Design a protein around this motif. Structure first.
Motif, short mmCIF file in Angstrom:
data_model
loop_
_atom_site.label_atom_id
_atom_site.label_comp_id
_atom_site.label_asym_id
_atom_site.label_seq_id
_atom_site.Cartn_x
_atom_site.Cartn_y
_atom_site.Cartn_z
N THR A 214 0.83 -1.19 0.00
CA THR A 214 0.00 0.00 0.00
C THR A 214 0.87 1.26 0.00
N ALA A 215 0.73 2.03 -1.09
CA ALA A 215 1.41 3.31 -1.33
C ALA A 215 1.26 3.60 -2.84
N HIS A 216 2.27 4.17 -3.50
CA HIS A 216 2.07 4.62 -4.88
C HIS A 216 2.29 3.53 -5.91
N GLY A 217 1.51 3.59 -6.98
CA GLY A 217 1.64 2.66 -8.08
C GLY A 217 1.58 3.33 -9.44
N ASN A 247 -2.75 -2.15 -3.19
CA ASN A 247 -3.66 -1.07 -2.82
C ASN A 247 -2.95 0.21 -3.21
N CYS A 248 -3.12 0.58 -4.48
CA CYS A 248 -2.39 1.69 -5.08
C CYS A 248 -3.02 2.00 -6.42
N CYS A 249 -2.55 3.06 -7.08
CA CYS A 249 -3.07 3.40 -8.40
C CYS A 249 -2.71 2.42 -9.50
N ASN A 282 -6.94 5.38 -10.59
CA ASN A 282 -6.30 5.79 -9.35
C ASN A 282 -7.04 5.25 -8.14
N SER A 283 -6.30 4.94 -7.09
CA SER A 283 -6.88 4.70 -5.77
C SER A 283 -6.46 5.84 -4.85
N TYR A 284 -7.07 5.89 -3.67
CA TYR A 284 -6.90 7.04 -2.78
C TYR A 284 -6.62 6.55 -1.38
N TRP A 285 -5.94 7.36 -0.59
CA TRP A 285 -5.51 6.90 0.71
C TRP A 285 -6.67 6.52 1.65
N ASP A 288 -8.66 3.32 0.36
CA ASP A 288 -7.89 2.06 0.51
C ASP A 288 -7.74 1.69 2.00
C1 LIG Z 1 -1.67 7.10 -7.67
C2 LIG Z 1 -1.33 6.27 -6.42
O1 LIG Z 1 -0.79 5.20 -6.52
C3 LIG Z 1 -1.78 6.80 -5.08
C4 LIG Z 1 -2.31 5.63 -4.20
C5 LIG Z 1 -2.65 6.10 -2.80
C6 LIG Z 1 -3.37 4.98 -1.96
C7 LIG Z 1 -2.42 3.96 -1.38
N1 LIG Z 1 -3.18 2.95 -0.68
N2 LIG Z 1 -2.85 7.78 -5.32
S1 LIG Z 1 -2.77 9.35 -4.81
O2 LIG Z 1 -3.71 9.53 -3.74
O3 LIG Z 1 -1.44 9.67 -4.29
C8 LIG Z 1 -3.15 10.42 -6.19
C9 LIG Z 1 -2.21 11.38 -6.56
C10 LIG Z 1 -2.50 12.23 -7.64
C11 LIG Z 1 -3.70 12.11 -8.31
C12 LIG Z 1 -3.99 13.04 -9.45
C13 LIG Z 1 -4.65 11.14 -7.92
C14 LIG Z 1 -4.37 10.29 -6.86
#
Ligand SMILES: *CC(=O)[C@H](CCCCN)NS(=O)(=O)c1ccc(C)cc1
Ligand SMILES: [K+]
Ligand code: NA
Ligand code: NA
Ligand SMILES: [Pb+2]
Length: 452
Positions: A214-217, A247-249, A282-285, A288
């Motif tokens: 879980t973090a960025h993808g 659990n990421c984008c 995209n997913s969101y913190w 998720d």
């Molecule tokens: C894009 C991504 O991987 C992260 C995932 C966060 C959730 C982790 N469990 N999304 S974000 O929230 O950082 C994000 C950043 C920029 C934009 C335009 C949309 C989403």
């Protein structure tokens, strides 16, 4: 509430509708044969059939009619297996996500929630489909030479200078506190809460049953700690296949110009995963966080089991229910939905999450939870011909299936007193060796035969 009204779709007898690209007919056979042997009534169709077609609208109409007809006959499909990449079964753009989704194959004609557990065995060649199948067959038949990797997991709260401490760590710490721990049978819970991450992915090679990041993808990577599709192709976890959840984008954005992370991790030969859960858009913190832990979780505060609703981790470890890969995703989506309903902080509609998350690989797999148990049963010495049912001893809750040559003849679930009434939808009328398979969540399968 939503948990009561829209819970686990699993039901018996198990029924599965399969829609597959025509190129996969030969490669698919061993998977279909095993699904029948373990008690799935299959309805298998290929896109070269006029009634199916190769275009979204016809495939969708075909599936919806099969579902509705099944339901009317008290025999609704439970699972929908899509076999192929978007060149043969396209999916369509999510109304909310604006990115590819398979949701509308399963949400019949007007419904919010899917009516079937849907998963996609995405392959670009028969050889790739075989790669997926062979991993699934090893895992489900438990023919791996060394089962010790089943007692190990990898959990990563990936990098984000701000969100790692607020959400990532609390998520993983919740999983470890309540489930992924020695008291549930896990001997090695490899976990990375923050940098340094060095060494983290080497555990994919040495062996884990489950990997959750879980973090960025991105479309082709877990971003940090970095695991790219190139690195996936160089994994060495022969005979040690896992479920992975990102659990990421966008790692499951399966119409991307290059194979996405979720596709690669399942397609790779004799390495990687038997299934992947990830997001197409995209997913969101926040969403998720709820997905994994449950509703009522709070940023920067360690959530408790008593203080949150049921999330994906919680559902996984219910012994009675939520025992498939698809059901883990369903539970997550339900939690994110509930969190919205009861007024938790959310900045996206629940509709989005149902459109977003997908299973790539085999969503009908029942994952083990640490070391699976040995089942108990009695095998009769013979089966008399021309019987509408048989009484078979097996531990309570076990599912018993009788078959021959990949044709399923009968199924039943053992009652509280350890007896399954196996209802024979096809009676035994010819001598031969008949297969008997007994399965149960977190038990090793029993695979035997009876001579008639
Ligand atoms: C894009 C991504 O991987 C992260 C995932 C966060 C959730 C982790 N469990 N999304 S974000 O929230 O950082 C994000 C950043 C920029 C934009 C335009 C949309 C989403
Ligand atoms: K950020
Ligand atoms: Na919870
Ligand atoms: Na469960
Ligand atoms: Pb693709």
């Amino acid at each position: 509430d939503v948990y009561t009204d829209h819970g686990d779709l699993y039901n018996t007898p198990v029924r599965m509708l399969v829609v597959a690209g025509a190129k996969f007919k030969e490669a698919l056979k061993p998977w279909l044969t095993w699904k029948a042997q373990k008690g799935f009534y299959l309805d298998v169709h290929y896109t070269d059939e006029a009634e199916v077609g190769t275009t979204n609208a016809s495939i969708k109409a075909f599936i919806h009619k099969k579902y509705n007809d099944g339901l009317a006959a008290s025999a609704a499909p439970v699972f929908l297996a899509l076999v192929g990449d978007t060149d043969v079964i396209s999916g369509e753009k999510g109304k909310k996500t604006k990115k590819v989704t398979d949701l509308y194959y399963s949400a019949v004609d007007g419904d919010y929630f899917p009516e079937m557990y849907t998963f996609r065995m995405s392959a670009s060649s028969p050889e790739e489909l075989t790669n997926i199948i062979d991993k699934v067959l090893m895992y489900e038949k438990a023919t791996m030479p060394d089962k010790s990797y089943l007692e190990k997991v990898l959990l990563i709260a990936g990098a984000d200078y701000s969100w790692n401490s607020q959400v990532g760590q609390p998520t993983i710490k919740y999983g470890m506190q309540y489930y992924y721990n020695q008291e549930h049978g896990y001997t090695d819970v490899y976990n990375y809460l923050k940098a340094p991450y060095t060494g983290c992915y080497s555990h994919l090679n040495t062996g884990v049953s489950f990997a959750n990041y879980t973090a960025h993808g991105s479309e082709t990577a877990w971003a940090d700690p970095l695991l790219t599709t190139s690195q996936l192709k160089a994994l060495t976890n022969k005979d040690k296949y896992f479920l992975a959840i990102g659990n990421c984008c966008i790692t499951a954005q399966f119409d991307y110009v290059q194979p996405c992370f979720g596709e690669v991790i399942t397609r790779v030969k004799e390495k990687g995963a038997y299934a992947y859960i990830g997001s197409s858009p995209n997913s969101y913190w926040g969403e998720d966080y709820y997905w994994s832990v449950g509703a009522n979780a709070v940023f920067g505060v360690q959530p408790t089991f008593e203080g949150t609703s049921m999330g994906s981790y919680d559902a996984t470890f219910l012994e009675d229910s939520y025992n498939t890969v698809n059901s883990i995703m369903w539970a997550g989506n339900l939690a994110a939905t509930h969190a919205g309903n009861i007024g938790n902080i959310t900045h996206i509609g629940a509709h989005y999450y149902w459109e977003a998350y997908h299973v790539l690989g085999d969503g009908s797999v029942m994952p083990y939870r640490a070391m699976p148990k040995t089942n108990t049963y009695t095998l009769p010495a013979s089966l008399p011909q021309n019987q509408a049912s048989y009484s078979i001893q097996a531990s309570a809750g076990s599912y018993v299936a009788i078959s021959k040559d990949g044709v399923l003849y009968g199924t039943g679930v053992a009652n509280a007193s350890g007896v399954a009434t196996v209802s024979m939808t096809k009676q035994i009328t010819e001598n031969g060796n008949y297969d008997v398979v007994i399965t149960r969540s977190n038990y090793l399968p029993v695979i035997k035969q009876i001579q008639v």
